[PDB]
């Protein structure tokens, strides 16, 4: 059984250097033709190939990132390290390392190369956020209005993830939509949480927001304005 | 470099259907192509290697064929765990490219979004910023287009949006879009509009308000 696992800092600041380690078990980077590669995935985006290293020590890099990447191996520790320099916000992504089989051998003779055509086992992935922000609690603002009515709370400018939002201390669940946060160009996150109700219920509505990182709890009752 | 284009980018289906996803390469990649299935929150999982070989432990309903520039993955009888995003990967040329992915989600009847526009709170305005949010609630299919207009000027580069994951009961999606402006710019205009295009809407729907109107 082959397993891989990524480790490194969850948070990194722009211009800094990011070092990610892939520790694995079940194979050796001294085994014939084996490879270990790195692939990343920005939130909501496609997979992007970064680099790979083989047991005979050949290395290859994405041409778009070549100047900022270094991949290396430590055979005796069963680890592969990828160093990315000068990171910027667009480098925020989940980073995965993965195993690549070498050709099948028969009495130590390569006879099948078909198994090298895939990365067959992946690590769970490590989430890395690139931002110069310091920890900071959200500002919470009201969002106020088939014949459904909508209202919500805009949880703005906080760092880092995550934040939790519930409605009426947990009693309101139907019609609730809490969207995934977006990382603003400022380096702070922002999210909305809304709830749809029969245009008659306008019943009371309060969003309970909690950002553990900054010890910031807020309950904000939202109503249909006009005094 | 080498381009790998997946089709379709998104696909709706129901348990028991037969689906086929295709991947085309800009130059021939021989048989060096792999297919993966990735479920939300998890790493991609290898299904097919070397264009058509079934990876060990992978269920037989998955099949891959093709070589050169055109490949296909077919799942013969879709199971609930197959609602996910699929990717193809080329390993003939460096860099080892991935396709854009194809999202496979639960099919249901077309449903237009209920649209709502929210002006910025007076509380936010006092801090100097103005957020205008637009909500597209419970729609299907997933693709939707939101266009912000301020006093009829098309907005660009000053909004961000996020979409919920498919609802497990509804099978619909919801989308939130935030237009952000300084309090000053905000004050220099009156009509804030959120224009929405979607398959379930005969023509675009616009929700708006005039700033300061009381």
């Amino acid at each position: 059984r082959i397993t891989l696992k990524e480790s490194g800092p969850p948070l990194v600041k722009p211009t800094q250097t990011l070092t990610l380690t892939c520790s694995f078990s079940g194979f050796s980077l001294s085994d014939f033709g084996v490879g270990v590669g790195w692939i990343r995935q920005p939130p909501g985006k496609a997979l992007e190939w970064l680099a790979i290293i083989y047991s005979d020590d050949d290395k290859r890099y994405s041409p778009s990132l070549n100047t900022r990447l270094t991949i290396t191996k430590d055979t005796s520790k069963n680890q592969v390290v990828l160093v990315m320099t000068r990171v910027s916000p667009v480098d925020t992504a989940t980073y995965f390392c993965a195993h690549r089989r070498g050709p099948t051998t028969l009495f130590g003779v390569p006879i099948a190369r078909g198994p090298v055509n895939a990365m067959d086992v992946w690590g769970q992935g490590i989430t890395v956020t690139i931002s110069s922000t310091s920890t900071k609690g959200p500002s919470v603002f009201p969002l106020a209005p088939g014949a459904a009515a909508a209202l919500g709370c805009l949880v703005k400018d906080y760092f880092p993830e995550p934040v939790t939002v519930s409605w009426n201390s947990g009693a309101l669940t139907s019609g609730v939509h809490t969207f995934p946060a977006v990382l603003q160009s400022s380096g702070l996150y922002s999210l909305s949480s809304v709830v749809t109700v029969p245009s008659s219920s306008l019943q009371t509505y309060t969003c309970n927001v909690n950002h553990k990182p900054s010890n910031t709890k807020v309950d904000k009752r939202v109503e249909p304005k006009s005094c | 470099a080498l381009q790998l284009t997946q089709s379709p980018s998104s696909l709706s289906a129901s348990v028991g259907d037969r689906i086929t996803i295709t991947c085309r390469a800009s130059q021939g990649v021989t048989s060096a192509l792999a297919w993966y299935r990735q479920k939300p929150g998890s790493p991609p999982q290898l299904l097919i290697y070397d264009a058509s070989s079934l990876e060990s432990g992978v269920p037989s309903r998955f099949s891959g064929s093709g070589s050169g520039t055109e490949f296909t993955l077919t799942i013969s009888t879709l199971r609930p765990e197959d609602f996910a995003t699929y990717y193809c990967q080329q390993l003939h040329f460096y860099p080892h490219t991935f396709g854009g992915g194809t999202r496979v989600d639960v099919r249901r009847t077309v449903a237009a979004p209920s649209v709502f526009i929210f002006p910025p709170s007076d509380e936010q305005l006092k801090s100097g910023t103005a957020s205008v949010v637009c909500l597209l609630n419970n729609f299907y299919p997933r693709e939707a287009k939101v266009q912000w207009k301020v006093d009829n000027a098309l907005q660009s580069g000053n909004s961000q949006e996020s979409v919920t994951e498919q609802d497990s009961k509804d099978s619909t999606y919801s989308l939130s879009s935030t237009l952000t402006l300084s309090k000053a710019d905000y004050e220099k205009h009156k009509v804030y509009e959120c224009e929405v295009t979607h398959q379930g809407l005969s023509s675009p729907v616009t929700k708006s308000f005039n700033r300061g109107e009381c």
Partner: peptide
Amino acid sequence: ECDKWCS
């Protein structure tokens, strides 16, 4: 260039 296992 070609993958490691070309030729």
